[PDB]
Amino acid sequence: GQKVHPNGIRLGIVKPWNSTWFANTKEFADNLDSDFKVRQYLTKELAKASVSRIVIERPAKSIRVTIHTARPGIVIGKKGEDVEKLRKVVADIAGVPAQINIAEVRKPELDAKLVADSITSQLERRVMFRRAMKRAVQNAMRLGAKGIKVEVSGRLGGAEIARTEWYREGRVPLHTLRADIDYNTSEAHTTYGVIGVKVWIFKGEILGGMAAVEQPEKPAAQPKKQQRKGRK
Template sequence: MGQKTHPFGFRLGVIRTWKSKWYEDKQYAKWLHEDLSIKEGIRDKFKHAGIADVEIERAANKAKVVIYTSRPGIIIGKGGAGVAQLKADLQKFTENELFVDIQEVRKAETNAKLVAENIATQLERRVAFRRAMKRAVQSA
Protein backbone atom coordinates (compact mmCIF):
# COMPACT_ATOMS: atom_id res chain seq x y z
CA MET A 1 0.00 0.00 0.00
CA GLY A 2 1.18 3.48 -0.82
CA GLN A 3 1.40 6.52 1.38
CA LYS A 4 -1.81 8.47 1.86
CA THR A 5 -1.84 12.22 1.26
CA HIS A 6 -4.40 14.40 3.03
CA PRO A 7 -6.64 16.13 0.45
CA PHE A 8 -6.30 19.56 2.07
CA GLY A 9 -2.51 19.40 2.01
CA PHE A 10 -2.62 18.11 -1.54
CA ARG A 11 -4.64 21.16 -2.69
CA LEU A 12 -2.62 23.82 -0.82
CA GLY A 13 -1.02 26.27 -3.19
CA VAL A 14 -3.02 24.98 -6.16
CA ILE A 15 -6.70 25.74 -5.51
CA ARG A 16 -6.60 26.63 -1.79
CA THR A 17 -4.51 28.97 0.30
CA TRP A 18 -3.11 28.71 3.79
CA LYS A 19 -5.22 29.75 6.81
CA SER A 20 -2.32 31.66 8.35
CA LYS A 21 -0.15 33.74 6.04
CA TRP A 22 3.18 34.58 7.65
CA TYR A 23 6.73 33.36 8.07
CA GLU A 24 8.94 33.53 11.14
CA ASP A 25 12.21 31.85 12.09
CA LYS A 26 12.78 32.57 15.76
CA GLN A 27 9.29 33.19 17.15
CA TYR A 28 7.44 30.55 15.13
CA ALA A 29 6.06 28.66 18.15
CA LYS A 30 4.96 31.88 19.86
CA TRP A 31 3.11 33.12 16.77
CA LEU A 32 1.54 29.72 16.20
CA HIS A 33 0.16 29.67 19.76
CA GLU A 34 -1.09 33.25 19.32
CA ASP A 35 -2.89 32.24 16.12
CA LEU A 36 -4.52 29.27 17.82
CA SER A 37 -5.63 31.31 20.84
CA ILE A 38 -7.02 34.08 18.59
CA LYS A 39 -9.02 31.58 16.53
CA GLU A 40 -10.26 29.78 19.63
CA GLY A 41 -11.25 33.08 21.28
CA ILE A 42 -13.25 34.15 18.24
CA ARG A 43 -15.05 30.82 17.96
CA ASP A 44 -15.85 30.76 21.70
CA LYS A 45 -17.21 34.31 21.72
CA PHE A 46 -19.31 33.95 18.56
CA LYS A 47 -20.62 30.39 18.62
CA HIS A 48 -23.88 31.24 16.89
CA ALA A 49 -22.56 33.79 14.38
CA GLY A 50 -21.98 31.21 11.66
CA ILE A 51 -18.21 31.58 11.46
CA ALA A 52 -16.95 29.71 8.41
CA ASP A 53 -13.27 30.55 8.60
CA VAL A 54 -10.67 32.73 10.34
CA GLU A 55 -7.55 33.80 8.45
CA ILE A 56 -4.56 35.56 9.99
CA GLU A 57 -1.98 37.54 8.04
CA ARG A 58 1.13 38.95 9.70
CA ALA A 59 3.75 41.43 8.57
CA ALA A 60 6.43 42.82 10.92
CA ASN A 61 4.53 44.00 14.01
CA LYS A 62 1.03 44.00 12.50
CA ALA A 63 -1.57 41.25 12.32
CA LYS A 64 -4.72 41.22 10.20
CA VAL A 65 -7.55 38.91 11.26
CA VAL A 66 -10.16 38.17 8.58
CA ILE A 67 -13.36 36.53 9.81
CA TYR A 68 -15.65 34.89 7.25
CA THR A 69 -19.18 34.63 8.62
CA SER A 70 -22.71 34.07 7.38
CA ARG A 71 -24.12 36.58 9.91
CA PRO A 72 -21.79 39.59 10.08
CA GLY A 73 -24.33 41.69 11.98
CA ILE A 74 -23.85 39.61 15.12
CA ILE A 75 -20.11 40.28 15.13
CA ILE A 76 -20.22 43.93 14.03
CA GLY A 77 -22.91 44.96 16.52
CA LYS A 78 -24.61 48.35 16.69
CA GLY A 79 -22.50 51.03 15.06
CA GLY A 80 -19.42 48.81 14.93
CA ALA A 81 -19.20 48.50 18.71
CA GLY A 82 -18.85 44.73 18.46
CA VAL A 83 -15.76 45.00 16.26
CA ALA A 84 -14.12 47.44 18.67
CA GLN A 85 -14.86 45.12 21.61
CA LEU A 86 -13.58 42.10 19.66
CA LYS A 87 -10.39 43.94 18.75
CA ALA A 88 -9.82 44.85 22.41
CA ASP A 89 -10.41 41.24 23.48
CA LEU A 90 -8.05 39.85 20.84
CA GLN A 91 -5.37 42.40 21.66
CA LYS A 92 -4.85 40.55 24.96
CA PHE A 93 -3.50 37.53 23.05
CA THR A 94 -0.77 39.39 21.16
CA GLU A 95 1.41 42.47 21.43
CA ASN A 96 1.19 43.10 17.68
CA GLU A 97 -1.13 45.76 16.30
CA LEU A 98 -4.37 44.06 15.24
CA PHE A 99 -6.69 44.84 12.36
CA VAL A 100 -10.04 43.01 12.25
CA ASP A 101 -11.91 42.53 8.98
CA ILE A 102 -15.35 40.92 8.68
CA GLN A 103 -16.28 39.24 5.38
CA GLU A 104 -19.78 37.92 4.68
CA VAL A 105 -20.28 34.43 3.27
CA ARG A 106 -23.01 35.03 0.71
CA LYS A 107 -24.26 31.47 0.30
CA ALA A 108 -24.02 29.64 3.60
CA GLU A 109 -25.56 26.55 1.99
CA THR A 110 -22.40 25.98 -0.07
CA ASN A 111 -20.03 26.02 2.90
CA ALA A 112 -19.68 22.54 4.42
CA LYS A 113 -18.77 23.80 7.88
CA LEU A 114 -21.81 26.08 8.11
CA VAL A 115 -24.13 23.33 6.85
CA ALA A 116 -22.73 20.93 9.47
CA GLU A 117 -23.20 23.49 12.26
CA ASN A 118 -26.77 24.10 11.08
CA ILE A 119 -27.55 20.37 11.17
CA ALA A 120 -25.93 20.07 14.61
CA THR A 121 -28.06 22.89 16.04
CA GLN A 122 -31.18 21.28 14.59
CA LEU A 123 -30.28 17.96 16.20
CA GLU A 124 -29.67 19.73 19.52
CA ARG A 125 -33.19 21.17 19.23
CA ARG A 126 -34.45 17.57 18.86
CA VAL A 127 -35.42 17.83 15.17
CA ALA A 128 -35.67 14.45 13.45
CA PHE A 129 -32.32 13.69 11.80
CA ARG A 130 -33.89 12.69 8.46
CA ARG A 131 -35.77 15.98 8.30
CA ALA A 132 -32.62 17.96 9.17
CA MET A 133 -30.64 16.16 6.46
CA LYS A 134 -33.37 16.65 3.85
CA ARG A 135 -33.54 20.38 4.61
CA ALA A 136 -29.77 20.70 4.28
CA VAL A 137 -29.68 18.83 0.98
CA GLN A 138 -32.61 20.78 -0.49
CA SER A 139 -31.23 24.18 0.51
CA ALA A 140 -27.86 23.35 -1.08
Protein backbone atom coordinates in the same frame (compact mmCIF):
# COMPACT_ATOMS: atom_id res chain seq x y z
CA GLY B 1 -11.54 4.45 6.24
CA GLN B 2 -9.19 5.60 3.44
CA LYS B 3 -8.02 9.00 1.94
CA VAL B 4 -5.99 12.14 3.05
CA HIS B 5 -8.08 15.02 4.17
CA PRO B 6 -9.16 16.89 0.84
CA ASN B 7 -8.21 20.47 1.70
CA GLY B 8 -4.82 19.39 3.17
CA ILE B 9 -3.32 18.69 -0.26
CA ARG B 10 -4.44 21.95 -2.04
CA LEU B 11 -2.71 24.52 0.11
CA GLY B 12 0.36 24.98 -2.11
CA ILE B 13 -1.64 25.59 -5.37
CA VAL B 14 -4.69 27.57 -6.39
CA LYS B 15 -6.02 27.51 -2.76
CA PRO B 16 -4.39 30.07 -0.34
CA TRP B 17 -3.60 29.05 3.38
CA ASN B 18 -5.67 29.38 6.61
CA SER B 19 -2.94 31.71 8.13
CA THR B 20 -0.43 34.07 6.41
CA TRP B 21 2.73 35.19 8.26
CA PHE B 22 6.57 34.99 8.31
CA ALA B 23 8.60 34.70 11.45
CA ASN B 24 12.06 33.42 10.17
CA THR B 25 12.04 29.82 11.54
CA LYS B 26 13.09 30.27 15.26
CA GLU B 27 9.91 32.43 16.14
CA PHE B 28 7.66 30.36 13.83
CA ALA B 29 6.39 28.18 16.72
CA ASP B 30 5.58 31.08 19.18
CA ASN B 31 3.73 32.76 16.32
CA LEU B 32 1.78 29.59 15.36
CA ASP B 33 0.87 29.05 19.08
CA SER B 34 -0.25 32.66 19.41
CA ASP B 35 -2.20 32.40 16.02
CA PHE B 36 -3.85 29.20 17.41
CA LYS B 37 -4.66 31.06 20.80
CA VAL B 38 -6.23 34.03 18.99
CA ARG B 39 -8.29 31.50 16.85
CA GLN B 40 -9.42 29.46 19.92
CA TYR B 41 -10.41 32.34 22.26
CA LEU B 42 -11.87 34.79 19.59
CA THR B 43 -14.50 32.35 18.02
CA LYS B 44 -15.99 32.05 21.54
CA GLU B 45 -16.33 35.91 21.73
CA LEU B 46 -18.36 36.21 18.44
CA ALA B 47 -20.47 33.04 19.52
CA LYS B 48 -23.63 35.32 19.00
CA ALA B 49 -22.81 36.03 15.33
CA SER B 50 -22.64 33.44 12.47
CA VAL B 51 -19.22 32.81 10.81
CA SER B 52 -17.87 30.36 8.13
CA ARG B 53 -14.17 30.92 8.43
CA ILE B 54 -11.27 32.77 10.20
CA VAL B 55 -7.91 33.90 8.50
CA ILE B 56 -5.21 35.31 10.64
CA GLU B 57 -2.19 37.25 9.51
CA ARG B 58 0.82 38.63 11.34
CA PRO B 59 2.63 41.62 9.74
CA ALA B 60 5.38 43.36 11.77
CA LYS B 61 4.28 44.59 15.19
CA SER B 62 0.55 44.04 14.26
CA ILE B 63 -1.95 41.18 13.99
CA ARG B 64 -4.49 41.46 11.22
CA VAL B 65 -7.66 39.40 11.40
CA THR B 66 -9.82 38.71 8.29
CA ILE B 67 -13.17 37.14 9.20
CA HIS B 68 -15.93 35.48 6.97
CA THR B 69 -19.59 35.84 8.04
CA ALA B 70 -23.25 35.04 7.09
CA ARG B 71 -23.88 38.81 6.39
CA PRO B 72 -21.82 42.16 6.47
CA GLY B 73 -23.39 43.70 9.73
CA ILE B 74 -23.39 40.83 12.27
CA VAL B 75 -19.84 41.12 13.72
CA ILE B 76 -19.70 44.91 13.10
CA GLY B 77 -22.53 45.50 15.56
CA LYS B 78 -23.91 48.81 16.73
CA LYS B 79 -21.81 51.86 15.84
CA GLY B 80 -18.64 49.73 15.25
CA GLU B 81 -18.39 48.97 19.03
CA ASP B 82 -18.81 45.25 18.73
CA VAL B 83 -15.78 44.81 16.34
CA GLU B 84 -13.72 47.30 18.43
CA LYS B 85 -14.31 44.96 21.52
CA LEU B 86 -12.97 42.07 19.22
CA ARG B 87 -9.83 44.00 18.29
CA LYS B 88 -9.28 45.03 22.02
CA VAL B 89 -9.20 41.38 23.24
CA VAL B 90 -7.09 40.11 20.23
CA ALA B 91 -4.53 42.76 21.28
CA ASP B 92 -4.70 41.37 24.90
CA ILE B 93 -4.17 37.80 23.62
CA ALA B 94 -1.50 38.55 21.06
CA GLY B 95 2.17 39.52 21.65
CA VAL B 96 1.36 42.57 19.47
CA PRO B 97 -1.43 45.24 19.17
CA ALA B 98 -4.27 44.18 16.73
CA GLN B 99 -6.26 45.22 13.51
CA ILE B 100 -9.54 43.64 12.10
CA ASN B 101 -11.45 43.81 8.65
CA ILE B 102 -14.57 41.90 7.50
CA ALA B 103 -14.21 40.15 4.17
CA GLU B 104 -16.77 40.07 1.28
CA VAL B 105 -19.68 37.63 2.05
CA ARG B 106 -20.04 34.67 -0.37
CA LYS B 107 -22.37 31.68 -0.51
CA PRO B 108 -23.54 31.77 3.20
CA GLU B 109 -26.59 29.49 2.39
CA LEU B 110 -24.23 26.91 0.85
CA ASP B 111 -21.23 27.00 3.23
CA ALA B 112 -19.89 23.73 4.46
CA LYS B 113 -19.96 24.60 8.24
CA LEU B 114 -23.33 26.54 8.40
CA VAL B 115 -25.05 23.46 6.90
CA ALA B 116 -23.20 20.99 9.24
CA ASP B 117 -24.15 23.14 12.39
CA SER B 118 -27.79 22.83 11.18
CA ILE B 119 -27.77 19.02 10.88
CA THR B 120 -26.01 18.45 14.33
CA SER B 121 -28.71 20.64 15.99
CA GLN B 122 -31.41 17.96 15.15
CA LEU B 123 -29.14 15.35 16.86
CA GLU B 124 -28.52 17.66 19.92
CA ARG B 125 -32.40 17.68 20.32
CA ARG B 126 -32.98 13.89 19.91
CA VAL B 127 -35.36 13.87 16.91
CA MET B 128 -36.19 10.50 15.32
CA PHE B 129 -33.92 11.54 12.26
CA ARG B 130 -36.11 9.68 9.76
CA ARG B 131 -35.88 12.10 6.86
CA ALA B 132 -33.17 14.51 8.06
CA MET B 133 -30.12 13.52 6.04
CA LYS B 134 -32.10 13.54 2.67
CA ARG B 135 -33.81 16.79 3.41
CA ALA B 136 -30.26 18.19 4.10
CA VAL B 137 -29.08 17.06 0.65
CA GLN B 138 -32.39 18.22 -1.03
CA ASN B 139 -32.33 21.85 0.28
CA ALA B 140 -28.53 22.16 -0.25
CA MET B 141 -28.93 21.22 -4.02
CA ARG B 142 -32.13 23.32 -4.20
CA LEU B 143 -30.26 26.49 -3.02
CA GLY B 144 -27.29 25.94 -5.34
CA ALA B 145 -23.98 24.09 -5.98
CA LYS B 146 -23.37 21.05 -8.30
CA GLY B 147 -22.96 18.11 -5.75
CA ILE B 148 -23.03 17.37 -2.03
CA LYS B 149 -21.89 14.46 0.17
CA VAL B 150 -23.17 14.23 3.72
CA GLU B 151 -21.87 11.68 6.22
CA VAL B 152 -23.54 11.48 9.73
CA SER B 153 -21.94 9.94 12.84
CA GLY B 154 -22.60 9.66 16.46
CA ARG B 155 -24.32 6.36 17.43
CA LEU B 156 -27.72 7.33 15.91
CA GLY B 157 -30.83 7.52 17.98
CA GLY B 158 -28.61 6.79 21.05
CA ALA B 159 -27.54 3.26 20.09
CA GLU B 160 -24.88 1.26 22.07
CA ILE B 161 -23.17 0.71 18.63
CA ALA B 162 -21.46 3.10 16.13
CA ARG B 163 -24.29 3.24 13.45
CA THR B 164 -23.59 5.61 10.48
CA GLU B 165 -25.35 6.72 7.36
CA TRP B 166 -24.32 8.91 4.31
CA TYR B 167 -25.70 10.34 1.08
CA ARG B 168 -23.73 11.79 -1.99
CA GLU B 169 -25.46 13.31 -5.04
CA GLY B 170 -24.36 15.06 -8.32
CA ARG B 171 -20.59 15.53 -8.64
CA VAL B 172 -18.20 15.42 -5.63
CA PRO B 173 -14.53 14.99 -6.79
CA LEU B 174 -12.17 13.84 -3.87
CA HIS B 175 -8.50 13.95 -4.91
CA THR B 176 -8.78 17.39 -6.55
CA LEU B 177 -5.73 19.73 -6.27
CA ARG B 178 -7.26 22.69 -8.32
CA ALA B 179 -10.18 24.97 -7.24
CA ASP B 180 -11.65 25.22 -3.82
CA ILE B 181 -14.16 22.60 -2.69
CA ASP B 182 -15.74 23.45 0.69
CA TYR B 183 -15.53 20.72 3.40
CA ASN B 184 -16.35 21.01 7.03
CA THR B 185 -16.22 18.29 9.81
CA SER B 186 -18.42 19.55 12.64
CA GLU B 187 -17.99 18.33 16.30
CA ALA B 188 -20.97 18.91 18.56
CA HIS B 189 -22.64 17.31 21.64
CA THR B 190 -25.93 15.55 22.69
CA THR B 191 -27.09 13.61 25.90
CA TYR B 192 -25.16 10.34 25.11
CA GLY B 193 -21.83 11.92 23.86
CA VAL B 194 -20.26 13.47 20.77
CA ILE B 195 -22.32 13.50 17.48
CA GLY B 196 -20.83 14.96 14.19
CA VAL B 197 -21.65 15.89 10.57
CA LYS B 198 -19.32 15.96 7.61
CA VAL B 199 -20.35 18.28 4.68
CA TRP B 200 -18.53 18.23 1.42
CA ILE B 201 -20.30 20.75 -0.96
CA PHE B 202 -19.02 21.55 -4.50
CA LYS B 203 -19.17 24.94 -6.41
CA GLY B 204 -16.66 24.48 -9.35
CA GLU B 205 -13.55 22.89 -10.86
CA ILE B 206 -12.00 26.22 -11.80
CA LEU B 207 -11.45 29.04 -9.30
CA GLY B 208 -8.89 31.80 -10.26
CA GLY B 209 -8.74 33.34 -6.70
CA MET B 210 -5.03 32.32 -6.68
CA ALA B 211 -2.87 31.84 -9.84
CA ALA B 212 0.77 32.24 -10.98
CA VAL B 213 1.81 35.68 -12.37
CA GLU B 214 1.04 36.72 -15.98
CA GLN B 215 4.57 37.53 -17.21
CA PRO B 216 8.33 36.61 -17.23
CA GLU B 217 10.71 38.88 -15.29
CA LYS B 218 11.71 41.14 -18.28
CA PRO B 219 8.29 42.71 -19.39
CA ALA B 220 6.93 42.99 -15.80
CA ALA B 221 8.20 45.94 -13.65
CA GLN B 222 10.91 48.42 -14.87
CA PRO B 223 11.33 49.47 -18.61
CA LYS B 224 15.03 50.05 -18.11
CA LYS B 225 16.21 46.77 -16.52
CA GLN B 226 19.57 46.46 -18.33
CA GLN B 227 23.08 46.16 -16.90
CA ARG B 228 26.49 47.45 -17.76
CA LYS B 229 28.06 43.95 -18.50
CA GLY B 230 31.14 44.40 -16.30
CA ARG B 231 32.99 47.61 -15.17
CA LYS B 232 33.53 46.46 -11.64
